[PDB]
Ligand binder design. Structure first.
Ligand SMILES: *[C@@H]1O[C@H](CO)[C@@H](O)[C@H](O)[C@H]1NC(C)=O
Lengths: 34, 50
């Protein structure tokens, strides 16, 4: 339960799965030149 | 579809091979306006509306 509607899609991409505390996950997100 | 309710399909995130369409003999009209068919297979576009 995260959304209620999806009207106009421009891009879809399905990929391989990325994934005491045992795991450390580092991510960097950047928006450069689109 | 009917001409009143013409279907629009947005083509994105793939490689468009236009030589397959141009070299077919099954089409009576292949009239291109504003661009030439020879350089379509080289150029790149944001989206294709069919
Ligand atoms: C976006 O969606 C609305 C309704 O969901 C529609 O009226 C509008 O034309 C759409 N715009 C594009 C660019 O798809």
């Amino acid at each position: 339960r995260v959304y209620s509607s999806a009207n106009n899609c421009t891009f879809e991409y399905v990929s391989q799965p990325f994934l005491n505390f045992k795991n450390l996950r580092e991510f960097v997100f950047k928006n450069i030149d689109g | 579809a009917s001409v009143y309710a013409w279907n629009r399909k947005r083509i994105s995130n793939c490689v468009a091979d236009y030589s397959v369409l141009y070299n077919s003999a099954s089409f009576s009209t292949f009239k291109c306006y504003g661009v030439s068919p020879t350089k379509l297979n080289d150029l790149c576009f944001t989206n294709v509306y069919a």
